Design a protein around this ligand. Structure first.
Ligand SMILES: Cc1cc2nc3c(=O)[nH]c(=O)nc-3n(C[C@H](O)[C@H](O)[C@H](O)COP(=O)(O)O)c2cc1C
Length: 147
């Protein structure tokens, strides 16, 4: 199968998470395309992929804002080919904020509304992802066994 992983990441934590997932899928025999959100165009982005994984960190002062490179993709998610696509979401944040990984909820909700098939509940990482590597790999295992 072919998997696409798209991530928005400003300090590297969601990027590190995306690459650890990519390695686990690649070792399972997938062909994986891992792209930063800053370099992609929404139109038709998911065409051809068996599985799409979207990851983003959460920002904003008092509100929920998505990571800046991911905003344009989020705003044009209806042109990506998400209807009927198997997807799953992930993201890093910090539990001291009101909306812990609130970008993950906003993306899952928009996908569900477009008719995507959410394969597993979102992976939500608190603090340093390097200290939660076991959770990331476990989650990557679960999504692969699901689709
Ligand atoms: C100003 C600011 C607002 C933040 N807002 C949230 C938030 O609303 N919820 C959350 O879970 N984390 C929030 N964070 C934490 C970042 O998401 C966290 O540092 C994360 O690891 C960044 O991941 P990234 O390196 O992939 O961009 C915020 C951090 C800053 C500095």
């Amino acid at each position: 199968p072919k998997a696409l992983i798209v991530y928005g990441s400003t300090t590297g934590n969601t990027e590190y998470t995306a690459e650890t997932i990519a390695r686990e899928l690649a070792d399972a025999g997938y062909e994986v395309d891992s792209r930063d959100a800053a370099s992609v165009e929404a139109g038709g982005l998911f065409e051809g992929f068996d599985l799409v994984l979207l990851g983003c960190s959460t920002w904003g002062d008092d509100s929920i804002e998505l990571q800046d490179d991911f905003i344009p993709l989020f705003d044009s998610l209806e042109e990506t080919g998400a209807q009927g696509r198997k997807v799953a979401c992930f993201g890093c944040g910090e539990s001291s904020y009101e909306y812990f990984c609130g970008a993950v909820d906003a993306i899952e909700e928009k996908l569900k509304n477009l008719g995507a098939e959410i394969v597993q509940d979102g992976l939500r990482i608190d603090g340093d992802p390097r200290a939660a590597r076991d959770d990331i790999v476990g989650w990557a295992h679960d999504v692969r066994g699901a689709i």
